[PDB]
Amino acid sequence: DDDEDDYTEYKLTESIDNILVKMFKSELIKLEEVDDSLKLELMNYCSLLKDVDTTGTLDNYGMGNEMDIFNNLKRLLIYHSEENINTLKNKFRNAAVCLKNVDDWIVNKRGLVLPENSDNMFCNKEYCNRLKDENNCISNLQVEDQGNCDTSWIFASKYHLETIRCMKGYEPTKISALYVANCYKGEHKDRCDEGSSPMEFLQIIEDYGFLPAESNYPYNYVKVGEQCPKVEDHWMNLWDNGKILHNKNEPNSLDGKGYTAYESERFHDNMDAFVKIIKTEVMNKGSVIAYIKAENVMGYEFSGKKVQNLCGDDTADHAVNIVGYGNYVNSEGEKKSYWIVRNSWGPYWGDEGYFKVDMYGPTHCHFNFIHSVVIFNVDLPMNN
């Protein structure tokens, strides 16, 4: 029952609190200062997380021994030496910390395959952070974890349609990502190990005309690849009355049925225009889809609170969502601007699932960290 759900979670919190006490003497302990009572509590922690984790992280990759776990946790504490005690107790619940090689965590956790009124107080042309407003529809769209499949094309696509629905008055009801993963036309594909793109999301909408709610057909990564289900009579259709629009090809955008896409490289010497497009769509639709390169860039220890200064490399393998933006004056006195970005790696990653990245990036970058953005062009009627 829901009871043992909470018993196991309690034991995990207890285990995490014991470890943190032993990891400090406050100054961190050196690896040779590691006695056998830590070694047992580390191993038991990971033995817990494994029996309970639903993300497939530890189903699939080698568990570290006690010294691997110790180093994994030591590196997390270093990368977050400022975080309150509670922000750190939070990251310890990413099962990636039990991995012999934490890089394993994202090998199959990507999923982009490139083809070819008062709302204005919280989101406006200067500043946008709807998460500071605990009443906002968009803020009740909780972060999700795609598990150990390459399905980020679904999570970022469906989030974008979820915020569009929020902007039109609908409740913050989650779309079933699993329905999109398992329901498609064409040749059979390995939906767990081979990603795709928001184009296919739109195609699946056209072909099936139905999007159930998460609770009708809920997601777990091991269920990716099972047969497309019969729609049951009680299922909600979150694509009710939706239509797929189609705008004219513009000279610096890629337009198609249901989407407009913009590539940062095409705006290389006009990035203010690129920024202005994204802000407008974040304000109007609640978010955009963004293409980025995750591999060898982001991992379990990635800071979600510091404004990251990242270069792109002119490729992308992961879809995320830009959900807001802001300005900061950095330590060196310069005024700079960041995107707020939502990931589908669960809430123990980044800043409760989100991160910040400089819009323009450092000056030496030949390519922007944001490879492309994609906006859906659909119609739904306002909710009364």
UniProtKB/TrEMBL annotation:
GO biological process: proteolysis
Gene Ontology CC: one annotated term: symbiont-containing vacuole
Domain Peptidase C1A papain C-terminal: 125-376
GO molecular function: cysteine-type peptidase activity
The UniProt record lists the keyword Aminoacyl-tRNA synthetase: no
Record carries keyword Ubl conjugation: no
Main location: membrane
Keywords annotated in UniProt: Disulfide bond, Glycoprotein, Hydrolase, Membrane, Protease, Signal, Zymogen
Tree of life domain: Eukaryota
Subcellular location, record wording: Membrane; Parasitophorous vacuole
Family in the record: Belongs to the peptidase C1 family.
Name of this protein: Serine repeat antigen 5
Range of the intact protein held here: 367 to 802 of 971
